[PDB]
């Protein structure tokens, strides 16, 4: 094969690889946009869960403040009677039990708050990765355009070298035939009808 045809095969193979690279990045972009959308969905669910468990904590706090209204009066501590002691002991038991339930509602609200912050960070990270893939995909498209333009220019150069090779061989063949026939014609030996 001619050097121009061999050069056109080399650049066509490089353009085929540039196409594969761009296509791989385009599929990566589409799969990464789906992961970002999945992370937005998971973040909206953690946001809802945080609001729900915060409301539950608020409801347990209101149960405490309602029970606190029932606090009995025990001021003569040296002369407490059995009914006043039972009233105070039962009030303290109810306040301690509500406090255990409030501590648990608060532990759960805090975990849900932390899970909402983690899902916000995960959404941010999937969007960061998506924007980086998009920058690489733009890079892939620019390299592919350059490879396409080069493969095309090499193919046209190969075609031009063959058109020129053919024109030159025809021009040399006609020049030799005319040179031979001019010797006869210049000596006055002329052509005649068939």
Residue numbers in the entry: 62 to 255
Give the authors' words.
Klebicin C (KlebC), a rRNase toxin produced by Klebsiella pneumoniae, binds TolC of a related species (K. quasipneumoniae) with high affinity through an N-terminal, elongated helical hairpin domain common amongst bacteriocins.
Crystallisation screens were focused solely on KlebC51-254 since this construct retained TolC-binding activity (similar to KlebC1-271) whilst removing the putative disordered region at the N-terminus. Modelled density spanned Lys62 to Leu255, with residues 64–131 forming helix 1 of the hairpin and helix 2 containing residues 145–248. The lack of density for residues 51–61 suggest that the disorder predicted for the first 50 residues may extend further into the molecule. Using disulphide-by-design, two interhelical disulphide bonds were engineered (L86C, L198C and A107C, Y177C) to lock the helical hairpin in the conformation observed in the crystal structure.
